[PDB]
Amino acid sequence: PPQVRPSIAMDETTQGQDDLTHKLSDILKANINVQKLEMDGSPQHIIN
Amino acid sequence: LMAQVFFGPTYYQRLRHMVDDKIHARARGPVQVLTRQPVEGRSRDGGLR
DNA sequence: GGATTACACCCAAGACACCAGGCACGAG
């Protein structure tokens, strides 16, 4: 939940995200590309 | 005084450490967002470790 | 290959580059 990775405001309104929030975005993006890649254009090396 | 006292001028220097720059007390106060525990530091009304 | 170098407090000074797109300005 957000309790573990709270947002912080560097200067005024501006807010950056916790390292886990950015890293979960990367896992989530990478998860979507496996969806599309498994179905088509997967001649072993691409999947690898 | 029954004893005599060594007495005379000496050069003394005033150092930066003054008590009103160090004194600190906390009852209740601000907490960290992440741990919900008292913050660190005199300048933030913090609590002792 | 990893494992560590006692505990506590305060001060000051820094935080993301590169390329494609639109919009505004100047000239013919």
Place this chain on the structure above:
RNA sequence: CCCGGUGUCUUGGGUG
């Protein structure tokens, strides 16, 4: 018309 709070990560020098 009550309640009402603001920062995270490092570097350098000290104090004991």
Place this chain on the structure above:
DNA sequence: CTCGTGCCTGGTGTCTTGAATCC
């Protein structure tokens, strides 16, 4: 009136090779 050219902004993003001794 219409085309050439510079500035602001957002989505995107990675690599020319260059301290010591206990279990």
